[PDB]
Subunit: 101 residues, 3 copies
Amino acid sequence: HMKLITAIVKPFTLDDVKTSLEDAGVLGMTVSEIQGYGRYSVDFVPKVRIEVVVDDSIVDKVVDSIVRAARTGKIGDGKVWVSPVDTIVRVRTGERGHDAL
Amino acid sequence: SHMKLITAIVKPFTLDDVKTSLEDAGVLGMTVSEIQGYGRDFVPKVRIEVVVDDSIVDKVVDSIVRAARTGKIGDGKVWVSPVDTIVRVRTGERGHDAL
Amino acid sequence: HMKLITAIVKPFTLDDVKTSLEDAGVLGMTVSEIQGYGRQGHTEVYRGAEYSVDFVPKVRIEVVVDDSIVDKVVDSIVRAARTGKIGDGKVWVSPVDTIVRVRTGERGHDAL
Ligand SMILES: Nc1ncnc2c1ncn2[C@@H]1O[C@H](COP(=O)(O)OP(=O)(O)OP(=O)(O)O)[C@@H](O)[C@H]1O
Ligand SMILES: Nc1ncnc2c1ncn2[C@@H]1O[C@H](COP(=O)(O)OP(=O)(O)OP(=O)(O)O)[C@@H](O)[C@H]1O
Ligand SMILES: Nc1ncnc2c1ncn2[C@@H]1O[C@H](COP(=O)(O)OP(=O)(O)OP(=O)(O)O)[C@@H](O)[C@H]1O
Protein backbone atom coordinates (compact mmCIF):
# COMPACT_ATOMS: atom_id res chain seq x y z
CA HIS A 1 0.00 0.00 0.00
CA MET A 2 2.91 2.49 -0.01
CA LYS A 3 4.13 4.06 -3.27
CA LEU A 4 7.11 6.18 -4.30
CA ILE A 5 6.46 9.10 -6.64
CA THR A 6 9.42 10.48 -8.59
CA ALA A 7 9.08 13.76 -10.47
CA ILE A 8 11.68 15.16 -12.86
CA VAL A 9 10.84 18.85 -13.26
CA LYS A 10 12.17 22.29 -14.30
CA PRO A 11 13.92 23.93 -11.34
CA PHE A 12 11.71 27.05 -11.40
CA THR A 13 8.47 25.11 -10.84
CA LEU A 14 9.71 23.77 -7.49
CA ASP A 15 7.86 26.45 -5.51
CA ASP A 16 4.63 25.87 -7.46
CA VAL A 17 5.03 22.07 -7.07
CA LYS A 18 5.69 22.38 -3.31
CA THR A 19 2.47 24.39 -2.64
CA SER A 20 0.64 22.06 -5.02
CA LEU A 21 1.80 19.23 -2.74
CA GLU A 22 0.80 20.91 0.56
CA ASP A 23 -2.75 21.65 -0.86
CA ALA A 24 -3.00 17.94 -1.79
CA GLY A 25 -1.99 17.10 1.80
CA VAL A 26 1.56 15.77 1.26
CA LEU A 27 3.33 17.03 4.35
CA GLY A 28 6.96 16.66 3.12
CA MET A 29 9.19 15.49 0.27
CA THR A 30 12.82 15.08 -0.77
CA VAL A 31 14.51 17.14 -3.47
CA SER A 32 17.85 16.87 -5.29
CA GLU A 33 19.38 18.43 -8.39
CA ILE A 34 19.80 16.29 -11.52
CA GLN A 35 21.26 16.68 -15.05
CA GLY A 36 18.81 15.68 -17.72
CA TYR A 37 19.23 14.54 -21.29
CA GLY A 38 16.17 14.63 -23.60
CA ARG A 39 14.53 16.15 -26.67
CA TYR A 40 28.35 17.52 -18.67
CA SER A 41 27.89 18.38 -22.37
CA VAL A 42 25.52 20.94 -23.98
CA ASP A 43 22.75 18.34 -24.26
CA PHE A 44 22.48 18.12 -20.45
CA VAL A 45 20.06 20.52 -18.70
CA PRO A 46 19.53 21.06 -14.96
CA LYS A 47 16.34 19.58 -13.48
CA VAL A 48 15.16 18.78 -9.92
CA ARG A 49 14.18 15.31 -8.71
CA ILE A 50 11.25 15.41 -6.25
CA GLU A 51 10.55 12.10 -4.37
CA VAL A 52 7.47 11.66 -2.11
CA VAL A 53 6.48 8.34 -0.44
CA VAL A 54 2.63 8.26 -0.14
CA ASP A 55 -0.37 5.97 0.51
CA ASP A 56 -1.68 4.34 -2.70
CA SER A 57 -5.17 5.88 -2.17
CA ILE A 58 -3.71 9.34 -2.57
CA VAL A 59 -1.31 8.72 -5.50
CA ASP A 60 -3.37 9.89 -8.50
CA LYS A 61 -4.15 13.26 -6.86
CA VAL A 62 -0.51 13.78 -5.91
CA VAL A 63 0.81 12.78 -9.39
CA ASP A 64 -1.70 15.20 -10.99
CA SER A 65 -0.98 18.10 -8.60
CA ILE A 66 2.74 17.70 -9.51
CA VAL A 67 1.85 17.50 -13.24
CA ARG A 68 -0.41 20.55 -12.84
CA ALA A 69 2.26 22.80 -11.18
CA ALA A 70 5.20 21.53 -13.30
CA ARG A 71 3.43 22.26 -16.64
CA THR A 72 4.99 24.94 -18.90
CA GLY A 73 3.87 23.95 -22.40
CA LYS A 74 7.48 24.00 -23.62
CA ILE A 75 9.70 20.94 -24.18
CA GLY A 76 11.63 19.56 -21.24
CA ASP A 77 8.81 19.72 -18.65
CA GLY A 78 9.74 16.24 -17.48
CA LYS A 79 8.03 13.17 -16.11
CA VAL A 80 6.40 11.73 -12.99
CA TRP A 81 6.50 8.05 -12.32
CA VAL A 82 5.42 5.75 -9.52
CA SER A 83 6.98 2.57 -8.19
CA PRO A 84 6.27 0.19 -5.23
CA VAL A 85 7.44 0.53 -1.63
CA ASP A 86 7.39 -2.64 0.58
CA THR A 87 7.86 -0.83 3.93
CA ILE A 88 8.73 2.53 5.41
CA VAL A 89 10.10 3.14 8.98
CA ARG A 90 10.40 6.47 10.78
CA VAL A 91 13.87 6.46 12.33
CA ARG A 92 12.94 8.37 15.53
CA THR A 93 10.15 6.09 16.68
CA GLY A 94 9.98 2.90 14.67
CA GLU A 95 6.55 3.71 13.28
CA ARG A 96 5.82 1.69 10.17
CA GLY A 97 3.56 2.35 7.17
CA HIS A 98 1.24 5.39 7.08
CA ASP A 99 2.32 6.24 10.67
CA ALA A 100 5.89 6.75 9.31
CA LEU A 101 4.95 9.66 6.98
CA SER B 1 2.88 -2.75 -16.27
CA HIS B 2 5.61 -3.40 -18.73
CA MET B 3 7.75 -0.50 -17.51
CA LYS B 4 11.06 -0.78 -15.70
CA LEU B 5 13.59 1.59 -14.14
CA ILE B 6 17.27 1.05 -14.98
CA THR B 7 19.72 2.46 -12.36
CA ALA B 8 23.46 2.34 -13.25
CA ILE B 9 26.17 3.40 -10.80
CA VAL B 10 29.17 3.95 -13.10
CA LYS B 11 32.55 5.76 -13.24
CA PRO B 12 31.95 9.46 -14.23
CA PHE B 13 34.21 9.30 -17.29
CA THR B 14 32.16 6.50 -18.87
CA LEU B 15 29.09 8.74 -19.21
CA ASP B 16 29.48 9.84 -22.79
CA ASP B 17 30.30 6.33 -23.94
CA VAL B 18 27.08 5.39 -22.03
CA LYS B 19 25.02 8.29 -23.53
CA THR B 20 26.01 7.35 -27.14
CA SER B 21 25.50 3.60 -26.41
CA LEU B 22 21.95 4.44 -25.26
CA GLU B 23 20.98 6.38 -28.48
CA ASP B 24 22.06 3.30 -30.45
CA ALA B 25 19.66 1.14 -28.42
CA GLY B 26 16.94 3.71 -29.32
CA VAL B 27 16.86 5.14 -25.78
CA LEU B 28 16.92 8.93 -26.07
CA GLY B 29 16.63 10.70 -22.67
CA MET B 30 18.21 9.82 -19.29
CA THR B 31 18.44 11.37 -15.81
CA VAL B 32 21.96 11.78 -14.24
CA SER B 33 23.18 12.69 -10.72
CA GLU B 34 26.49 12.73 -8.85
CA ILE B 35 26.81 10.20 -6.01
CA GLN B 36 29.51 9.25 -3.52
CA GLY B 37 30.35 5.54 -3.76
CA TYR B 38 31.64 3.40 -0.90
CA GLY B 39 32.77 0.00 -2.23
CA ARG B 40 36.51 -0.80 -2.57
CA ASP B 41 36.85 7.02 1.70
CA PHE B 42 34.29 7.43 -1.07
CA VAL B 43 34.79 7.58 -4.81
CA PRO B 44 32.76 10.02 -6.99
CA LYS B 45 30.32 8.17 -9.33
CA VAL B 46 27.40 8.98 -11.67
CA ARG B 47 24.00 7.51 -11.23
CA ILE B 48 22.14 7.12 -14.49
CA GLU B 49 18.41 6.38 -14.33
CA VAL B 50 16.35 5.64 -17.38
CA VAL B 51 12.76 4.37 -17.56
CA VAL B 52 12.18 1.83 -20.37
CA ASP B 53 9.68 -0.71 -21.74
CA ASP B 54 10.40 -4.23 -20.55
CA SER B 55 10.72 -5.51 -24.19
CA ILE B 56 14.06 -3.70 -24.29
CA VAL B 57 15.30 -3.69 -20.62
CA ASP B 58 17.66 -6.63 -21.26
CA LYS B 59 19.40 -4.94 -24.28
CA VAL B 60 19.54 -1.53 -22.56
CA VAL B 61 21.18 -3.09 -19.47
CA ASP B 62 23.77 -4.83 -21.71
CA SER B 63 24.57 -1.69 -23.66
CA ILE B 64 25.15 0.22 -20.39
CA VAL B 65 27.42 -2.60 -19.10
CA ARG B 66 29.45 -2.61 -22.33
CA ALA B 67 29.99 1.15 -22.45
CA ALA B 68 30.84 1.32 -18.72
CA ARG B 69 33.31 -1.60 -18.46
CA THR B 70 37.01 -0.99 -18.11
CA GLY B 71 37.92 -4.29 -16.42
CA LYS B 72 39.31 -2.40 -13.42
CA ILE B 73 37.61 -2.66 -10.01
CA GLY B 74 34.85 -0.14 -9.14
CA ASP B 75 33.07 -0.32 -12.55
CA GLY B 76 29.75 -0.27 -10.69
CA LYS B 77 26.38 -1.95 -10.94
CA VAL B 78 23.25 -1.67 -13.03
CA TRP B 79 19.95 -2.71 -11.53
CA VAL B 80 16.30 -2.98 -12.68
CA SER B 81 13.15 -2.08 -10.70
CA PRO B 82 9.41 -1.95 -11.48
CA VAL B 83 7.73 1.25 -12.58
CA ASP B 84 3.95 1.09 -12.08
CA THR B 85 3.14 4.25 -13.99
CA ILE B 86 4.85 7.10 -15.84
CA VAL B 87 3.31 10.37 -17.19
CA ARG B 88 4.74 13.01 -19.58
CA VAL B 89 4.23 16.39 -17.79
CA ARG B 90 3.66 18.52 -20.90
CA THR B 91 1.01 16.31 -22.54
CA GLY B 92 -0.32 13.92 -19.86
CA GLU B 93 0.66 10.94 -22.05
CA ARG B 94 1.21 7.66 -20.23
CA GLY B 95 3.25 4.43 -20.48
CA HIS B 96 5.26 4.05 -23.71
CA ASP B 97 3.92 7.43 -24.98
CA ALA B 98 5.41 9.13 -21.86
CA LEU B 99 8.95 8.05 -22.86
CA HIS C 1 14.99 -11.53 -4.23
CA MET C 2 17.00 -8.34 -3.97
CA LYS C 3 15.73 -5.18 -2.28
CA LEU C 4 16.75 -1.55 -2.36
CA ILE C 5 16.96 0.11 1.03
CA THR C 6 16.63 3.93 1.00
CA ALA C 7 17.65 5.87 4.10
CA ILE C 8 17.10 9.62 4.48
CA VAL C 9 19.12 10.58 7.59
CA LYS C 10 21.03 13.45 9.24
CA PRO C 11 24.33 13.97 7.38
CA PHE C 12 26.34 13.66 10.65
CA THR C 13 25.15 10.08 11.36
CA LEU C 14 26.80 8.73 8.12
CA ASP C 15 29.89 7.30 9.92
CA ASP C 16 27.76 5.39 12.51
CA VAL C 17 25.44 4.20 9.70
CA LYS C 18 28.34 3.07 7.54
CA THR C 19 29.90 1.26 10.49
CA SER C 20 26.57 -0.32 11.50
CA LEU C 21 26.19 -1.61 7.93
CA GLU C 22 29.62 -3.25 7.67
CA ASP C 23 28.72 -5.05 10.95
CA ALA C 24 25.73 -6.54 9.10
CA GLY C 25 28.07 -7.82 6.32
CA VAL C 26 27.13 -5.04 3.90
CA LEU C 27 30.24 -3.88 1.99
CA GLY C 28 29.24 -0.99 -0.27
CA MET C 29 26.68 1.78 -0.32
CA THR C 30 25.60 4.65 -2.55
CA VAL C 31 25.34 8.12 -0.89
CA SER C 32 24.00 11.49 -2.24
CA GLU C 33 23.01 14.85 -0.76
CA ILE C 34 19.33 15.91 -0.65
CA GLN C 35 17.27 18.94 0.48
CA GLY C 36 14.61 17.55 2.80
CA TYR C 37 11.31 19.06 3.78
CA GLY C 38 8.98 17.98 6.57
CA ARG C 39 7.97 18.48 10.21
CA GLN C 40 11.50 19.93 10.60
CA GLY C 41 13.53 24.61 7.18
CA HIS C 42 16.82 25.01 9.06
CA THR C 43 19.15 27.83 10.22
CA GLU C 44 22.05 29.17 8.09
CA VAL C 45 24.80 31.72 8.43
CA TYR C 46 26.16 34.78 6.59
CA ARG C 47 29.16 36.65 8.00
CA GLY C 48 28.30 35.41 11.47
CA ALA C 49 24.56 36.35 11.26
CA GLU C 50 21.93 33.59 11.10
CA TYR C 51 18.93 33.22 8.80
CA SER C 52 16.18 30.72 8.11
CA VAL C 53 15.80 28.54 5.01
CA ASP C 54 12.94 26.16 4.01
CA PHE C 55 14.72 22.87 3.29
CA VAL C 56 17.05 20.90 5.51
CA PRO C 57 20.13 19.07 4.17
CA LYS C 58 19.90 15.27 4.54
CA VAL C 59 21.95 12.35 3.33
CA ARG C 60 20.34 9.71 1.05
CA ILE C 61 21.82 6.26 1.56
CA GLU C 62 21.14 3.41 -0.92
CA VAL C 63 21.95 -0.27 -0.37
CA VAL C 64 20.91 -3.28 -2.51
CA VAL C 65 20.63 -6.30 -0.21
CA ASP C 66 19.13 -9.83 -0.20
CA ASP C 67 15.62 -10.61 1.05
CA SER C 68 17.09 -12.46 4.09
CA ILE C 69 19.42 -9.72 5.40
CA VAL C 70 16.86 -6.90 4.73
CA ASP C 71 15.24 -6.63 8.20
CA LYS C 72 18.54 -6.70 10.10
CA VAL C 73 19.90 -3.98 7.80
CA VAL C 74 16.92 -1.60 8.10
CA ASP C 75 17.06 -1.98 11.92
CA SER C 76 20.82 -1.53 12.00
CA ILE C 77 20.45 1.77 10.01
CA VAL C 78 17.56 3.01 12.21
CA ARG C 79 19.60 2.41 15.46
CA ALA C 80 22.59 4.23 14.00
CA ALA C 81 20.70 7.29 12.62
CA ARG C 82 18.37 7.68 15.61
CA THR C 83 19.27 10.66 17.84
CA GLY C 84 16.12 11.29 19.85
CA LYS C 85 15.58 14.73 18.38
CA ILE C 86 13.24 15.44 15.42
CA GLY C 87 14.23 15.06 11.78
CA ASP C 88 16.05 11.72 12.15
CA GLY C 89 14.53 10.53 8.85
CA LYS C 90 13.13 7.44 7.27
CA VAL C 91 14.19 4.17 5.74
CA TRP C 92 12.10 2.40 3.14
CA VAL C 93 12.47 -0.88 1.18
CA SER C 94 11.59 -1.37 -2.54
CA PRO C 95 11.81 -4.21 -5.11
CA VAL C 96 14.82 -5.02 -7.30
CA ASP C 97 14.17 -7.31 -10.34
CA THR C 98 17.85 -7.89 -11.17
CA ILE C 99 21.30 -6.46 -10.40
CA VAL C 100 24.46 -7.04 -12.45
CA ARG C 101 28.15 -6.26 -11.68
CA VAL C 102 29.51 -4.10 -14.51
CA ARG C 103 32.99 -5.74 -14.63
CA THR C 104 32.07 -9.44 -14.44
CA GLY C 105 28.44 -9.64 -15.53
CA GLU C 106 27.73 -11.44 -12.25
CA ARG C 107 24.06 -11.39 -11.48
CA GLY C 108 22.09 -11.59 -8.22
CA HIS C 109 23.83 -12.01 -4.87
CA ASP C 110 27.01 -12.61 -6.86
CA ALA C 111 26.74 -8.96 -8.08
CA LEU C 112 26.88 -7.44 -4.56
N1 LIG D 1 13.56 7.53 -20.45
C1 LIG D 1 13.75 8.48 -19.50
N2 LIG D 1 13.86 8.10 -18.21
C2 LIG D 1 14.06 8.97 -17.20
N3 LIG D 1 14.15 10.29 -17.38
C3 LIG D 1 14.06 10.83 -18.60
C4 LIG D 1 13.84 9.95 -19.78
N4 LIG D 1 13.77 10.78 -20.85
C5 LIG D 1 13.92 12.05 -20.41
N5 LIG D 1 14.10 12.08 -19.06
C6 LIG D 1 14.27 13.27 -18.18
O1 LIG D 1 13.23 14.18 -18.54
C7 LIG D 1 13.79 15.45 -18.83
C8 LIG D 1 13.01 16.02 -19.98
O2 LIG D 1 13.07 15.05 -21.03
P1 LIG D 1 12.50 15.49 -22.46
O3 LIG D 1 13.30 16.70 -22.92
O4 LIG D 1 12.45 14.23 -23.29
O5 LIG D 1 11.08 16.11 -22.01
P2 LIG D 1 9.68 15.40 -21.68
O6 LIG D 1 8.87 16.34 -20.83
O7 LIG D 1 9.74 13.93 -21.28
O8 LIG D 1 9.02 15.46 -23.15
P3 LIG D 1 8.72 16.90 -23.81
O9 LIG D 1 10.00 17.68 -23.55
O10 LIG D 1 8.49 16.49 -25.25
O11 LIG D 1 7.50 17.46 -23.10
C9 LIG D 1 15.21 15.15 -19.27
O12 LIG D 1 16.09 16.30 -19.23
C10 LIG D 1 15.57 14.02 -18.34
O13 LIG D 1 15.87 14.58 -17.06
N1 LIG E 1 25.01 -3.04 -2.06
C1 LIG E 1 25.18 -1.93 -2.81
N2 LIG E 1 24.10 -1.20 -3.17
C2 LIG E 1 24.19 -0.12 -3.94
N3 LIG E 1 25.36 0.36 -4.41
C3 LIG E 1 26.52 -0.27 -4.10
C4 LIG E 1 26.52 -1.47 -3.27
N4 LIG E 1 27.81 -1.87 -3.17
C5 LIG E 1 28.56 -0.99 -3.87
N5 LIG E 1 27.78 -0.04 -4.42
C6 LIG E 1 28.17 1.08 -5.28
O1 LIG E 1 28.91 0.47 -6.31
C7 LIG E 1 30.16 1.15 -6.51
C8 LIG E 1 31.24 0.15 -6.92
O2 LIG E 1 31.16 -0.90 -5.95
P1 LIG E 1 32.42 -1.82 -5.53
O3 LIG E 1 33.71 -1.08 -5.86
O4 LIG E 1 32.07 -2.50 -4.25
O5 LIG E 1 32.41 -3.08 -6.55
P2 LIG E 1 31.88 -3.05 -8.08
O6 LIG E 1 32.52 -1.92 -8.86
O7 LIG E 1 30.39 -3.30 -8.05
O8 LIG E 1 32.56 -4.42 -8.61
P3 LIG E 1 34.16 -4.66 -8.73
O9 LIG E 1 34.77 -3.72 -7.72
O10 LIG E 1 34.22 -6.10 -8.29
O11 LIG E 1 34.51 -4.26 -10.14
C9 LIG E 1 30.44 1.81 -5.16
O12 LIG E 1 31.28 2.96 -5.32
C10 LIG E 1 29.06 2.13 -4.62
O13 LIG E 1 28.60 3.35 -5.20
N1 LIG F 1 6.53 11.82 2.20
C1 LIG F 1 7.88 11.86 2.12
N2 LIG F 1 8.50 11.32 1.04
C2 LIG F 1 9.84 11.33 0.92
N3 LIG F 1 10.65 11.86 1.85
C3 LIG F 1 10.18 12.47 2.98
C4 LIG F 1 8.74 12.50 3.19
N4 LIG F 1 8.56 13.13 4.37
C5 LIG F 1 9.77 13.46 4.88
N5 LIG F 1 10.74 13.07 4.03
C6 LIG F 1 12.19 13.23 4.22
O1 LIG F 1 12.53 12.81 5.53
C7 LIG F 1 13.03 13.95 6.28
C8 LIG F 1 12.52 13.97 7.72
O2 LIG F 1 11.13 14.32 7.68
P1 LIG F 1 10.30 14.94 8.95
O3 LIG F 1 10.79 16.38 9.10
O4 LIG F 1 8.82 14.68 8.76
O5 LIG F 1 10.89 14.14 10.22
P2 LIG F 1 10.89 12.55 10.53
O6 LIG F 1 12.23 12.10 11.07
O7 LIG F 1 10.22 11.81 9.42
O8 LIG F 1 9.87 12.56 11.78
P3 LIG F 1 10.20 13.20 13.22
O9 LIG F 1 10.67 14.61 12.87
O10 LIG F 1 8.84 13.14 13.90
O11 LIG F 1 11.20 12.24 13.84
C9 LIG F 1 12.70 15.20 5.44
O12 LIG F 1 13.65 16.27 5.61
C10 LIG F 1 12.70 14.65 4.02
O13 LIG F 1 14.05 14.47 3.51
